[PDB]
Amino acid sequence: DTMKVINDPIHGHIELHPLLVRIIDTPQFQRLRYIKQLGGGYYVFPGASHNRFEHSLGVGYLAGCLVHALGEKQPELQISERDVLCVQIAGLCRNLGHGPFSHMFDGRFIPLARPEVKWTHEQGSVMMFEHLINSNGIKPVMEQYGLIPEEDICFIKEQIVGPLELWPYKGRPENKSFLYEIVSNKRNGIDVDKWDYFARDCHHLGIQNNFDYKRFIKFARVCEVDNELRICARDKEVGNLYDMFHTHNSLHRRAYQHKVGNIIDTMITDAFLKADDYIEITGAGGKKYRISTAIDDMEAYTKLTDNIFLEILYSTDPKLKDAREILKQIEYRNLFKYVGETQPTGQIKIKREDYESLPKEVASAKPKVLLDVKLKAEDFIVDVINMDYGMQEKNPIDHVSFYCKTAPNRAIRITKNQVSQLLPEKFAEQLIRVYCKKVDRKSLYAARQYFVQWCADRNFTKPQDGDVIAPLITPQKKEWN
Amino acid sequence: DTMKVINDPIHGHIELHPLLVRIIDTPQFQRLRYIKQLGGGYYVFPGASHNRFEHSLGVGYLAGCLVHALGEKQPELQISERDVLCVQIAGLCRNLGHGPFSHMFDGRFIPLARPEVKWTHEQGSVMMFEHLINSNGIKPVMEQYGLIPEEDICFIKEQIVGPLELWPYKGRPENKSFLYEIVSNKRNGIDVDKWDYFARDCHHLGIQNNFDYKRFIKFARVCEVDNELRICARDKEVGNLYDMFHTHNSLHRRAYQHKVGNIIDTMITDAFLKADDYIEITGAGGKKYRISTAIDDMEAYTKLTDNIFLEILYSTDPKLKDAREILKQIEYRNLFKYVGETQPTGQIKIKREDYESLPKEVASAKPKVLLDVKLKAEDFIVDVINMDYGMQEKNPIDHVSFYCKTAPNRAIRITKNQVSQLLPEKFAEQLIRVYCKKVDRKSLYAARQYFVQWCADRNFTKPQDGDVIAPLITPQKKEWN
Amino acid sequence: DTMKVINDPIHGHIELHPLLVRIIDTPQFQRLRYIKQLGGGYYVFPGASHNRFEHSLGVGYLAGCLVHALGEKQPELQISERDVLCVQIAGLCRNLGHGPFSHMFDGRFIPLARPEVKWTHEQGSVMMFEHLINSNGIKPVMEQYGLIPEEDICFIKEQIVGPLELWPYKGRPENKSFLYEIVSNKRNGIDVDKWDYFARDCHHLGIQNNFDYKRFIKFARVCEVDNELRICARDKEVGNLYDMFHTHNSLHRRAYQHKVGNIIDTMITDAFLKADDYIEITGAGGKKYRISTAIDDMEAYTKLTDNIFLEILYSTDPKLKDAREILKQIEYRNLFKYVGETQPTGQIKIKREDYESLPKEVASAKPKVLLDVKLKAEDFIVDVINMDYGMQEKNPIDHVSFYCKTAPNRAIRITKNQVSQLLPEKFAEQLIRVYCKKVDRKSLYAARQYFVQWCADRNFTKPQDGDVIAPLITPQKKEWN
């Protein structure tokens, strides 16, 4: 077997080592062809047809590029082809755990269907990787190309999910610490996964990408930091790193958290919950699983993709009627109606455990407007979105090491004041979107009154359209006037 | 209801009239989200994730652009908003008839499954359009925006499939003849459908586009030709028009007729044929249809998409075992092996009626080589591909009208000799690809000997790798030496 | 005479009205072919070969696009083709006043050569426009295409420089106030000039533009604000407007204020000052002007371009030896050496009249380090750069009017807190770059010590490389560590 070339629209001609080809040509990997990268986003951005499969190839490619470039610039690092292949495999395989419509499945569906369980795509990726290796006799092939399966499978899993539990990693020692910063960077979030989707999502969405990963790679070096060898950026590049996170935030606002994209994801999740008792997925030993339980058996999970959406939509079973009708409403674009958006003020943060109480609170508000219809908790959806620079309220640039032209081996820190006074003072916030399941002109008018009243009651920010949608409510609040 | 904006990666911000929105937001239209533009092409170009739906939006947009630009430059044409909307709807809806994996369904599957029937995606588009209109109460909405359903539905169908059957059209008179040249140009093949997929397919494939549709539109005018008003191009654009067809041919060789893309389409078609007796699709009145018969009932056809591939792949029914195993082999990349390509010489053209005889002919060849295994007709696939400039052997530029700067209202013809002696002397040819279902080293060696012998016997062109794959065979033929 | 088409790499096919063609085809306009958009930037970004000429065509085009789009969406505005042509001419002509190397001439050279005079490129553009009109008999051509020269020439000049010599404008009344916001927006800086150079500079520099002007135009409307008709943006676009200024700041940091680009501009300015007594430029009546006085006669200024650089570089006159030697040093790349960058802390602002005292201050600093060479005021250059959102310390988004979907005719304001807590808290800052004219290793070491000491003395920010370039100095300051 020899190397294969793939032509990617983002990266151009990608060379794949024969071991990588063997991992890719499995049911467990090919499954990613049937999961949309941006899930419900496709229903708002018709260009966003792209699947997790091509994203995965790109992450593998970029992982290879970064590790190769470090090895070429700094031969003293003793980066081995074995190291390169392991970093490529981790890059290729870190998306294996995604379920139907990607972030909708682990972000929305599993939390509601299985509140007791703690599930992440990262955990899923490790389980599916193990299933891929074991089901397809990969370990012999790994040894053929000079890999140490016990050590290297551990190394690959650690790159994906972090320590599997003082140096906490078993796959590689402290002198190769920098290898763990490439595929999934737990220290500051600067990794090749972000670089691929920035470029790929933008290409498909019709938004332009402001971040130059190629420049970052050219200016990356490994330096000693606190007795670890770590990837350091050139001091001058600090502005571009702030801009990388700015780009991420912009993509979330414009696309990933698009108000309609989110409500379509919500409606699909509701359809999946109503279908969950009736859809059967055959796993290991012919045992039957549900959408919600396929995560417990990787053989079943292998066959759980966006297809479930079409199975429900095209079904005739009366049991699936309620689920089917929700998806049919999506096709007619009879969506739950966006009422508006607000933000908590100051340090106020809404907790996960409180999310279910929020619809009741909106319905409980007393507007001081004559209302045609009276709305109930069940008529409202409240979506809370945490927007940050990937480290909650921490500045990720405080967790980056830099080097200077005059001393390229010496790691330094750069503080925010050393860069620009025009940068963000805060690095996290919450967006609260409210929608109404009643699409009536009178119901929507009522929903707007409840919403703006709830905002005033809770001292949330004035909705941007507040003076138009609720002219009788907005005056009461002095902060808004 | 008001206009909606869609952000497309190819076209940027597209405005959609509310009537267009109502047509788009139907099960019959949204179905195109679940049919890949390039079918098996996605399995060779991982970027080609794009579906018929986003292509359809683009064709609608470009149809609007061309008709608007003509109206702005030449108010004397009396192009009406009613005309603009009808051209947009035809552009939007000309892809409605595509089936699973697009050209695979009407190009490969239906011809083999239902040899008696004459089926085209164009015919399918007209039937699905009628079903869309009737199922969703569109006619009242058409009248609301100033359309006359009887005349305008006729006009839209005629733009898609041509005369429904001396001016042969009923939807519009001879003074609006140019409107029929926009969406599906039967005269010379220069239409907005080609312009969208050139740009869209290239964007996704990773291949570059060498055609400027925007320039064509800027230089397009309507002039009188033989008592018809027709779209004329500026004389100096003739080179760019030859290049447009050159681009089309390049995309076919590189992507649409990729040898592996074609064999994957062949293998999927074979799986569909083996599954056809057992897959049931519920149509009108709860009646059950097969993959092959869903084309007879638009309610059933509405639910026939690429999903059928996954229904088969994920099935447990023993009846579907043979179909399922073919798709599983695709996932393992255990594909039928490409043996080589040849061309007929001179005028020789192979017709469909003896396509089935070609595998037997290859197996019947007697290469003067000692062979380990002896191969049978059933072990060979022979794929014949007609490559042309869209009008069989004819030069489409002989069917284009031009105008000169000094007389912009006066239509002229331009001959090939007036342009360049570097242009093609022929405008059609055939490619013959041969594959072997036996994938072992000995069988592949034997297949290569049979193939090159068959080429020599039939006076076909010397395979490019002929001297390497069959060094004992190639010397016999003097034309090759 | 009819419309001409120009193919621009940024905008594609641009249509130019015959009146626009007549203005463009003059010595006064064609002169912009010989002035680089980014001046010294070309010597750092080899792609930045682009001249003011092609920028001007783009500004004219975009001015036309915006005014046309407003007129199409809101016919009630009664925008006339006379209005469209006047806005296009202003867009085309607002760059006519630029001198050699663009911002270097009005930003650096004229302030030093002629401190008494107040000169701007805007004033220059008005003078050159008048000279263009009068020298080329344009007024008759304006009348031929329905313009009224007296009113319309006033309107065009007002669009370029603002109120010519209570509604302060004479060219158009308050009901056409929005027309003054297109070409040069004095209210908030959102104008088509910025949109062209963002896209054009990025195309040439090799950095990507993430501002979407086309989307802005689609969402622009005219609404009543304080008894004026003004351009309003859609409320939801507020994020993209913050991002537009973010983009502008990024382009300044990365390119326009590149430390080496700036020093090359400084060195060229110094060469021009030393050549100013000796270069003669023939103006009106054969009278002779200097580089510094050509601004006083538009006939002379017509012949003042980047060519002056080459006239000096290629000169043999002993009088020009000092000027010539500076330019020759640029070619050998031995330029003045960058020592470092610092910022004033908090609100501290360095005044224009204090700039010349700063080199003396650096030379006067007493670093507690043993020094091989002692440097003098003349050996230092101190460059102060004001970085802002185009309205000094003011937030330009406080000066933008928005509209909501539910009330598209009703203008609203949006405050920073209503948008995001991640946005800048400040909208202006100063960067201070220090360079040394002595390039030897010993002199550069000394320059670094003086610089970091000066920073500590003045409580400026710690240079990013401070611990490397001045390890003995940095410890003294506790704020730095």
Added chain:
Amino acid sequence: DTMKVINDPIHGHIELHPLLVRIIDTPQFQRLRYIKQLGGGYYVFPGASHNRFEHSLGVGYLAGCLVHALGEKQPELQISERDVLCVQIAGLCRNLGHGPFSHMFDGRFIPLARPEVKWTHEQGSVMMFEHLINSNGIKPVMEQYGLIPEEDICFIKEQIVGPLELWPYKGRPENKSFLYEIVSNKRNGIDVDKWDYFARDCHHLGIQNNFDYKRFIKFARVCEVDNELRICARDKEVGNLYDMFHTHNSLHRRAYQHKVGNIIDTMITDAFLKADDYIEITGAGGKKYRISTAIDDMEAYTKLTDNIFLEILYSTDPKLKDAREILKQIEYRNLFKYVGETQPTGQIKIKREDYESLPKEVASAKPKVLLDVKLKAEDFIVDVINMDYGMQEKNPIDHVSFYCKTAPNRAIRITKNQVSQLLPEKFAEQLIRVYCKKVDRKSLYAARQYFVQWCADRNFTKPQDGDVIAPLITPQKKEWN
């Protein structure tokens, strides 16, 4: 002292070895900043502001890419860093010999000014390279980085101009023959110089490039051909190679041989001829040269750039009045008027010796039309353009070696019939453009009659607009009817 990074819009971040930096930072190299790549093309495509300097950096970069990729894939080639640097320097320096407005100088001006001399930009590049090396003490720096000046300077010159004189090269032996195919490919014209300008010119012109050099590099290998090691392409890539030359032809038609671009180059050449007696350029020992004689002294040639255009345009000397007036007419766009284009039929080829007789022939034609004005030889310009695939009438693909996947070390040939019957039957042709120096309506009408009559007399092709511009003439010729 270390590598420098340059951000190029085409190639992104380019790394330059310190030796390359030293060669670049010289008057002889920096001179290329003041010569437009496409000369008069800028006066038709305002985007084409790009200079020979940035093209040169790109050619150096791509030369490096190809040699590096071959070395990585085939270590057995024993490609050395010394080899890599020499190939990069040749790539960087092969444009050093270009004069004002690039191809205008060696294509039009020198042939007319100095008919006795044989001058090429390639010869100029070798002379300027020698001058660069000797003037700037480069030889010591070459030795510092492991080059052997005697052998390596020979090798570099040979890559640029071919043998300086059975193996005809002295710089490297037959086992490194493939190195001579990278920078300037005399065998088939497939070189990195073409790859850079295709991408760079397209970026600036606003035309799209359909050639993928990156793919070519990935599929390039070295194989033995007739006892030489040569670069071979993968068999499958033959289509893309035909397309590469198709792209080159398209760029020539659309841009490089644009009818107006060519006439502006003609008018500038005429201005240079009229100025040649009076412009003085100081060379070595203070000796004075003319535009036409600066090629004899590299010190003088160093100072001969596009600036000469502005020196003439801005001059006051009465001696330069005639030259100055031609350039002033260019600014007013009072260009010689395009009359039309024709082609010789069959094999007929117009010789260089005959070019001057062609204006007389047009003026001598007797159109059967009543004419207001009678035109003379001096009133006509006849421009003859040879359009080919870079090897006159030969197919360059007949001069390419390929390899097959089954035998990657075995070189093969591919014939045209093995590829496609849709490819060109001829690989060279001539375009004849005619212009009139008399621009008035009556003179232009007369010029059109003479031109179309001359075409009929000489059995040239029917002008595209023939029936519009000469309706009385076209009928006489029955080949045209």
